[PDB]
Amino acid sequence: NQEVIAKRYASALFQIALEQGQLDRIEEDVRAVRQALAENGEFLSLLSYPKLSLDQKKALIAEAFAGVSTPVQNTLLLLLERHRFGLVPELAEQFLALVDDARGIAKAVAYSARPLTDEELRALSDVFAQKVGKQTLEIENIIDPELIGGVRLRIGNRIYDGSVSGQLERIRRQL
């Protein structure tokens, strides 16, 4: 139930970021806030503590997040007043997921046994960006050597496995 409530907040912040026309200053700041809240987990236990009054928690956010953008600060101060500060990293991650649909960029993860050169990465990125419909495509490589001399590509929830799947389909079709 938590992810759809994060999605509501992220879609509201996405609509106000698309309406205000300050999209990059919102996006990089929410990325920095998500990194800072993934760095330390004791800040949620600090803001869940009952003897601190709501004005002290609001001043604590306004002091600790003094450099953030104004719609992001208003969003987090609404999240504090709703007892929803335990829901902020998921909505930050879903906000960065939804802003890349506006940019058109998709994030792909490629499991390769050998580290691939950048020219083939750019070629497959342009090819599957023309296939999937993206303007450009971001490729994240891994150094897992379990693949049999190949690369398997993950485009969201639809994967392109061609490394050990040949031998797997061979021993499946043999029996």
């Binding site: 497959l124 049999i148 001399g149 061609g162 021993i171």
Partner: protein, 51 residues
């Protein structure tokens, strides 16, 4: 016994198939990765383009 016999034969192909796949992978693994990895990427990219 006749049915069973067909099953014993099938089971037998299968036990052996199982061993065969594990070695085929080990021989495959043993083969080069320099030039062959360059081919596989090139080929992978070509393949995706056909698909």
């Amino acid at each position: 016994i006749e049915r069973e016999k067909e099953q014993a034969m099938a089971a037998l192909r299968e036990q052996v198939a199982s061993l065969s796949v594990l070695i085929a992978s080990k021989v495959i693994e043993k083969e080069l990765t320099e030039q062959d990895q360059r081919k596989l990427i090139e080929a992978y990219i070509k393949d995706v383009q056909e698909v």
